[PDB]
Structure 1
Amino acid sequence: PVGNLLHTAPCAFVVTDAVEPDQPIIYVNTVFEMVTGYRAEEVLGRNCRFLQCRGPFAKRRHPLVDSMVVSEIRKCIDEGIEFQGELLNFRKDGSPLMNRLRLTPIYGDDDTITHIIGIQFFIETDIDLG
């Protein structure tokens, strides 16, 4: 028996304020809410990096997140350009997702960057975690 289908494309995305300190989340779409397990009120105003800790309670990023990719994200955000890579993330229930992630900055009335759009493509993964 088939229902409770989704009508659109399953694309997950987030928007951040590139004006306030440290890219706070101002918008998540409900595909994000439904793949990650985090509701929008849980994540508004927070930086996206909680996805790199495994669970809602863990406060340090997981060892197997590639500290080099995360470094490159930081470069791109800072140099005002597009990031594109793949990075271990974690659902609220603990499960691992390879996040095939793309960051695109948006300019306002200026030549200043006012927002960044983030497009997650979470992929299931059988990474051994201990």
Structure 2
Amino acid sequence: MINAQLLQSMVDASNDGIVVAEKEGDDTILIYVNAAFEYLTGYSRDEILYQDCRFLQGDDRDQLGRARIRKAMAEGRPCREVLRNYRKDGSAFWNELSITPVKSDFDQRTYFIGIQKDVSRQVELERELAELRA
């Protein structure tokens, strides 16, 4: 279709937070993040890169999304889950995570492309509708 350099620059430049990570045992290590992801998190490419993405959950580690994500990556099937995340400045938001497993098949490595959005307003709208139905 298009040359891969063009595509990489279209991704580098996307308004959508986009990352790639590589499975290592019980971890997945971020090898690629775009600018919009740096803007979403309030971190820098260097701060972010080369660790597992969970670091954004911070203290708040009892969240059902985790298990559903973990369950889903394990089975090798895409998921979409929203977790509470925290920026560098400490502020808190609902991050929707779209995670897709990709096995290399050239080798035994598996990768994941994430695509993430601050969903905080969409959630507030639901908490409200939930209480109206009560």
Scaled to the shorter chain, the TM-score interval is 0.7 to 0.9
Structure 2 Cα separation of the partners of residues 69 and 17 of structure 1: 20
Q: Where is the helix percentage greater, Structure 1 or Structure 2?
A: 2
2:35 maps to: 30
Structure number with higher relative contact order (C-alpha < 8 Å, ≥ 6 residues apart):
1
Contact 2:20 2:113 in 1 (8 A): yes
Q: State the number of aligned residues.
A: 110
1:101 maps to: 97
Question: Is 1:80 equivalent to 2:76 in the alignment?
Answer: yes
**TM-score normalised by length of structure 2:** 0.72
Question: Is 1:10 equivalent to 2:15 in the alignment?
Answer: yes
Identity of aligned residues (%): 40
Q: 1:101 to 1:92 in 2, by over 3 A?
A: same
Question: Is 1:44 equivalent to 2:49 in the alignment?
Answer: yes
Letter in 2 for 1:31: A
Gaps of 5+ in 2: 1-12, 125-134
Q: Bigger radius of gyration, 1 or 2?
A: 2
Gaps of 5+ in 1: 1-7, 54-60
The alignment yields a C-alpha RMSD, in angstroms, of: 2.3
Structure 2 Cα separation of the partners of residues 50 and 35 of structure 1: 14
